[PDB]
Amino acid sequence: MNIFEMLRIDEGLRLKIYKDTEGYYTIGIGHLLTKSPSLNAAKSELDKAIGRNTNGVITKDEAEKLFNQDVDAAVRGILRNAKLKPVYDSLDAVRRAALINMVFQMGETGVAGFCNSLCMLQQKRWDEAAVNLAKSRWYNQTPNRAKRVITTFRTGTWDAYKNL
């Protein structure tokens, strides 16, 4: 297992514009197009992202291209963030993937919101972090995904992602 396989499990793959769990227009492997209510606004973002007239539909290779970019950007975002970098640097490889997964979902700003949990992770208090992570809108809104990421932080293994 690796970050790519992990996110493909959590996000799925869809080749037509769809609305995510928050109702925002999305395509591919969780690539957010826009928070605007307008389908036209989303189609225009899509075309600009892909570099062609797509009419709301993309290929598998295009989806994977967006995904590669988005994972690289989340990794580079963590490494330039003064709050996140010291946490990521402290973690083992499996737990680093869990942090990337959170940043991919909710952005840098949203994760820097979890400062209590981040301080517990940096100190390697895994059971305590896992409890604090769950007291969040994130856990309440997407509990099955949150539980997989939290389990990965608690254990430092890929066990939540094997068998599905």
Q: What does the chain look like in DSSP terms, one character per residue?
A: --HHHHHHHHH--EEEEEE-TTS-EEEETTEEEESSS-HHHHHHHHHHHHTS--TTB--HHHHHHHHHHHHHHHHHHHHH-TTTHHHHHHS-HHHHHHHHHHHHHHHHHHHHT-HHHHHHHHTT-HHHHHHHHTSSHHHHHSHHHHHHHHHHHHHSSSGGGTT-
Question: 150 and 133 in contact (C-beta within 8 Å)?
Answer: yes
Q: State the catalytic residues.
A: 11, 20
CATH code for 3-161? Answer: 1.10.530.40
Method: X-ray
What's the resolution in A? Answer: 1.8
Beta carbons within 8 Å of 106's beta carbon, 6+ residues apart: 138
Tokens in use for 154?
A: 């608690």
